[PDB]
RNA sequence: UGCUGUUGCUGUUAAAGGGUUCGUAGUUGAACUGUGGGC
RNA sequence: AGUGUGGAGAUCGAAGAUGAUUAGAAACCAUUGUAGUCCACACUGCAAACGAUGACACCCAUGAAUUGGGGAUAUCUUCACGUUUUCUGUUUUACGCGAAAGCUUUGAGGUUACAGUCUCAGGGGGGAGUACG
């Protein structure tokens, strides 16, 4: 969007300003805490486990049915991810563009964004140490 | 001003005054736009016709009548129309109030150059046709006269002060709506106390063609 | 001295950065595309005093059946434009 | 109380200029496009009661086509047009 | 027209048009329904804008199909609206 | 004159100077 | 005199015999009697304060004109600024003095601190601008004079005003519009609107 | 970047009181943007104003009435003491009869004529008249 | 637009100006060790010579006349 | 002499926006924990 | 455009050659023609590299259109289109500003009624983007 490039778009989503569940839910918010945490068994993301419970089961927000958060929940029985999530996927995305580099190296298109991707990473290592969420002298 | 004072509710579009504007055709607009006129615009029909809501149409109607019976002196007020279709109009309007009428092409000077032996000084001015009556309008602004229009549609609003949403490019249309103003500004003198009906005919104010 | 809030060109503020160049139909001379006037023109390949006498003795063309044409797209630079 | 008084009590205003309608303005001498529009006032009977209400506007309302929505509006609240349509 | 509209309390026509973020206070697009399955006797609740693969007990093959905005609904089945 | 050209005859000093600076030298 | 205006007529006839109902219903004025009408011949003082050519080129040589700028004023109050060009340097004297007085403005004059005596100040900061120049006005404690350039200076004596410090920018060599620019400063002392006149105005007819 | 929501919320007012439009919308807003408005409105140069609320930094619809010429914020907020206030007054201020400067002081949010009767001294926050 | 604006910004405003300043000719040549160097009088207000020569030196157009001067 | 501009300058065409990006010191940085009541 | 090393060499074509033209032609015109032009790797780091207009954020009047996505409710074939809203781009046609030419929801507007944040340059014209390092 705007970190990187000239793009301005705005989609997102917008929350509901009454926080209470429906009426029509009927389940406990024990058995919500503990679907999230065999779905975090089956090896998906936070940001998948929201998805699954939201579209086919009708739990639209966790943190209004149980009162705290997926990342909460999952850091309490230890099964959080090593690293961040979003830090995660932004390595994996430069892995596969030097490995495509490697190969094609008159690519220059990609070499440009290849750049911007590791400068992101820089910036977002540097936040994550100072809040103790990364091993100091972590590197990339 | 429909609401008359005190409540009386006298000045109303009765059944009799709807049909007269329908059979003219006096709230059938041109397909064109204009944002002016947006909040005098109801609806639009089929071919891309634009309708004007009857009531406030009337609502203006009344107020222009209330402007022009104002004055101490009749003969001050003038009407202009440069259109050939409202010559009839604005001739036998003047004739039943007392008011000076002007028709033709407009020689452009008359209300600022004080050599010229044609000065007229109004305090109100009509005008049929804004868009092409922009010479009269223009002038006006340069000697603090207000100006009452006709607007249709699709109108340049600029300097008018009492705009009457309503047609004025046809032939029935032009010479009906003069009638309900000439018929409105007497009632409120006190020449009739009702005048219903009238013994005036519609198509003296028509422009029959000559 | 601006004489053209388009330059000349139907390229506006930044929205290209080049235009593939073309050849004058008369000259030769290189223009961007969008500069070069373009006009495509139809015409018949004879005139009229000369198209009467071939399809009087033509068995093909007449009445019914009409004349090809020649149909061409022409871009000129402005200045070939100018004294044409 | 309008103008201004010293402490000794004597008004220095020369003259007050008139206020716009509209936008509380005040009128200049030098405007020639501001204008003043007096509206009758009829009773029950159907014919006026001999006065006018008076109301004035500035030049750069004319100049802008903006005067006829201020007049539009300044008439619903002085009770000179009806604000909404009749029911049946 | 002859009416003055108010910031804080705006009316009906002039809110529907408005984008969600826009309001004055902003708010989801979205609902939940009921879904009577293909073949299955069974309910579901299914998100209105979903985009992961929804199945069911007695027709687990499809229950929506993902798309670009709102789902689009398998044929054959039962869909209403719930409340909040 | 031009610019360019001037540019040009500022460029043809600037070269000899060199070399006679380093035959000089 | 022959009255040529309604305005006029009202001026001859003693129906208007105040200058204050011009400026109120902003009228504007058409013939310069009505000023000699409406005030007394003895406070009306007018001065020209440079003339100067200018050329236009023709095809066997040029052709001169001449400006002249002329300035009125009551030294209570009121203040007109006027610049015609003729063919004679007579003509264009006439015509400016005519002008002047066809273009009155009052100027409202306030206090710096304590109401006490007579106004001898203007109310509040202003500027105008004619061209590239701009000239502002600030008011200023009592016994000061006027800070002014000779040029300024003079319009300033003539509209009534005593303490006043002023500021230039621009080309101010420009005497002809330095003279307009220091007249829409004055000019635009009666549009603001002060909390001393808040409300509680009432029309007339 | 938004960097001083005081600067923007002040910027829309005089904005559309120079239009001569009769009501305004802000977003967002803060407690100091609603202490600088309560200080207008004890003078009177606007009317009465609404702070809606959504769970996040709230708008604030004010009305206004036409007696306001002009708002605005002073950036960097400098220190003013008692002895400042004169030099202030004559820099930013079209005359020493109306408008006033706002300060934020230990006391709170004040005009300068209100903070020099209290013998205060404080930062500058902006400006009315 | 072309200032900082900054409350602990100082420093950029301090050497804004110390940099700019030598664009002024005038400021430039009083805080120059180098001025009054190629001035023949070496700063003062009068000197002393010896004429060894008269020349004439011719005035400049659009004047025509003979300048009387002298070498020292 | 607001022609050194913190108050207080200019940068389309008069003198002057870097070919485009990334980036470290530096400068700048969203909302919230608070209407005291009664006589 | 130019440089180095290997390819390639159709077209066009700096240098050059031969005709025209011209007091004169080194040029403009005609016929040719080498380096170039094309490719890979390695250098160079400059352009009327222009919107002659630095980046980020807020407000702002009217009428056009048009590109991509989404929401609601008249036609054609066995997906396209019609109407009205909406988000992002991309152009044409008021207050206000400017010395003017002109700019104007995408400002050169909101500025002597001068303060949202950061940053790069300028200080009469030449010498000169030259000399020394
Ligand atoms: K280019
Ligand atoms: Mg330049
Ligand atoms: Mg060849
Ligand atoms: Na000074
Ligand atoms: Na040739
Ligand atoms: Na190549
Ligand atoms: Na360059
Ligand atoms: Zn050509």
């Given at each position: 969007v705007r970190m990187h490039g000239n793009g301005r778009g705005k989609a997102s989503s917008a929350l509901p300003y009454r926080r209470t569940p429906p009426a029509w839910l009927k389940i406990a918010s024990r058995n919500v805490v503990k679907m999230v945490c065999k779905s975090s068994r089956k090896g998906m993301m936070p940001s998948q486990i929201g998805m699954e419970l939201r579209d086919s089961m009708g739990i639209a927000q966790v943190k209004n049915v149980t009162g705290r958060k997926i990342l909460r929940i999952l850091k309490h029985n230890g099964?959080?991810?090593?690293?961040?999530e979003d830090l995660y996927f932004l390595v994996k995305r430069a892995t596969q563009m030097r490995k495509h580099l490697e190969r094609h190296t008159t690519d220059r298109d990609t070499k440009y964004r290849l750049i911007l991707v590791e400068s992101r990473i820089h910036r977002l290592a540097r936040y994550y140490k100072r809040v103790k969420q990364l091993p100091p002298t972590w590197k990339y | 001003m429909s609401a008359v004072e005190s409540g009386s509710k006298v000045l109303r579009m009765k059944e009799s005054d709807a049909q007269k504007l329908l059979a003219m055709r006096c709230h059938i607009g041109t397909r064109n736009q204009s944002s002016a006129m947006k909040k005098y615009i109801y609806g639009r029909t089929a071919e891309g016709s634009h309708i004007i809501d009857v009531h406030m149409m009337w609502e203006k109607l009344i107020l222009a009548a209330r402007v022009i019976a104002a004055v101490e002196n009749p003969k001050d007020v003038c009407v202009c129309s440069s259109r050939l279709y409202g010559t009839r109009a604005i001739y036998k309007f003047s004739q039943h109030v007392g008011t000076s009428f002007h028709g033709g092409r407009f020689i452009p000077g008359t209300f600022t150059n004080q050599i010229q032996k044609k000065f007229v000084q109004p305090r109100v001015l009509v005008v049929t046709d804004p868009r092409t009556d922009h010479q009269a309008i223009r002038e006006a602004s340069l000697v603090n006269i207000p100006v009452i229009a006709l607007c249709d549609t699709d109108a340049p609003l600029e300097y008018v002060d009492i705009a009457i949403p309503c047609n004025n490019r046809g032939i029935k249309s032009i010479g009906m709506m003069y009638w309900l103003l000439a018929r409105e500004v007497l009632r409120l003198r006190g020449?009739?106390?009702?005048?219903?009906?009238?013994?005036?005919?519609v198509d003296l104010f028509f422009y029959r063609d000559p | 001295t601006t004489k053209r809030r388009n330059h000349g060109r139907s390229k506006p503020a930044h929205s290209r950065g080049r235009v593939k160049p073309i050849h004058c139909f008369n000259c030769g001379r290189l223009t961007p595309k969008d500069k070069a006037v373009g006009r495509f023109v139809v015409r018949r390949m004879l005139d009229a005093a000369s198209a009467r006498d071939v399809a009087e003795a033509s068995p093909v063309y007449g009445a019914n059946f009409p004349m090809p044409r020649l149909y061409m797209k022409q871009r000129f630079c402005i200045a070939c434009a100018i004294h044409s | 109380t309008i103008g201004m008084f010293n402490e000794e009590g004597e008004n220095v205003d020369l003259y007050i200029p008139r206020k716009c309608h509209a936008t509380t303005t005040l009128i200049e001498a030098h405007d020639h496009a501001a204008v003043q529009i007096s509206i009758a006032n009829v009773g029950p009977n159907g014919v006026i009661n001999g006065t006018t209400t008076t109301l004035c506007i500035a030049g750069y309302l004319r100049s802008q086509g903006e005067s006829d929505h201020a007049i539009n509006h300044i008439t619903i609240d002085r009770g000179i047009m009806r604000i909404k349509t009749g029911k049946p | 027209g002859f009416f003055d509209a108010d910031l804080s309390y705006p009316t009906v026509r002039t809110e529907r048009m408005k984008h969600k973020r826009r309001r004055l206070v902003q708010g989801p697009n979205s609902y939940f329904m009921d879904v009577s399955c293909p073949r299955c006797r069974q309910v579901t609740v299914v998100y209105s804008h979903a985009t992961t693969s929804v199945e069911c007990?007695?027709?687990?093959?499809?229950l929506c199909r993902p798309t670009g905005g709102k789902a689009l609904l398998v044929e054959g089945c039962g869909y209403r609206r719930k409340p909040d | 004159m031009r610019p360019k050209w001037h540019k040009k005859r500022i460029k043809r000093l600037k070269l000899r100077r060199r070399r006679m600076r380093q035959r000089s030298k | 005199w022959v009255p040529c205006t309604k305005l006029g007529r009202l001026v001859k006839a003693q129906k208007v015999t105040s200058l204050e109902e011009i400026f109120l219903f902003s009228m504007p004025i058409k013939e310069h009697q009505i000023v000699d009408t409406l005030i007394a011949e003895g406070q009306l003082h007018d001065e020209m304060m440079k003339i100067y050519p200018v050329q236009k080129a023709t095809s066997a040589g040029q052709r001169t004109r001449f400006k002249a700028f002329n300035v009125v004023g009551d030294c209570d109050g009121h203040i007109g600024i006027g610049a015609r060009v003729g063919k004679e340097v007579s003509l264009a004297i006439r015509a400016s003095m005519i002008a002047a007085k066809l273009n009155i403005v009052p100027v409202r004059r306030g206090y710096w601190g304590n109401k006490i005596g007579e106004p001898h100040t203007i109310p509040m900061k202003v500027t105008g601008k004619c061209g590239s120049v701009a000239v502002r006005l600030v008011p200023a404690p009592r016994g000061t004079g006027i800070v002014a350039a000779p040029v300024p200076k003079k319009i300033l004596e003539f509209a009534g005003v005593e303490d006043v410090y002023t500021s230039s920018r621009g080309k101010t060599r420009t005497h002809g519009n330095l003279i307009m620019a220091t007249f829409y400063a004055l000019r635009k002392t009666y549009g603001f609107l002060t909390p001393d006149l808040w409300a509680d105005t009432e029309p007339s007819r | 970047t938004m960097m001083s929501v005081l600067a923007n919320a002040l910027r829309t007012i005089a904005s559309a009181e120079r239009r001569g439009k009769r009501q305004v919308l802000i977003r967002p807003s803060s407690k100091v943007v609603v202490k600088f408005l309560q200080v207008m409105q004890k003078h009177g140069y606007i009317g009465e104003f609404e702070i809606i609320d959504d769970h996040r930094a709230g708008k604030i619809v004010v009305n206004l009435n036409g007696r306001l010429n002009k708002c605005g914020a002073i950036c960097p907020r400098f220190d003013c003491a008692t002895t400042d206030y004169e030099k202030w007054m004559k820099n930013?201020?079209?005359?020493?009869q109306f408008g006033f400067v706002v300060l934020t002081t230990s006391l709170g949010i004040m005009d300068h004529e209100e903070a020099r009767s209290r013998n205060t001294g404080g930062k500058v926050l902006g400006f009315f008249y | 637009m072309t200032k900082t604006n900054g409350q602990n910004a100082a420093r950029k405003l301090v050497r804004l100006r110390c940099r700019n300043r030598w664009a002024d000719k005038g400021w430039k040549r009083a805080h120059t060790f180098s001025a009054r160097k190629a001035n023949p009088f070496g700063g003062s207000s009068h000197a002393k010579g010896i004429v060894l020569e008269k020349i004439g030196v011719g005035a400049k157009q659009p004047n025509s006349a003979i300048r009387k001067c002298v070498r020292v």
């Open positions: 099964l959080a991810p090593e690293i961040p | 020449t009739i106390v009702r005048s219903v009906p009238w013994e005036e005919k | - | - | 007990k007695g027709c687990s093959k499809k | - | - | 930013i201020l079209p005359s020493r | -």
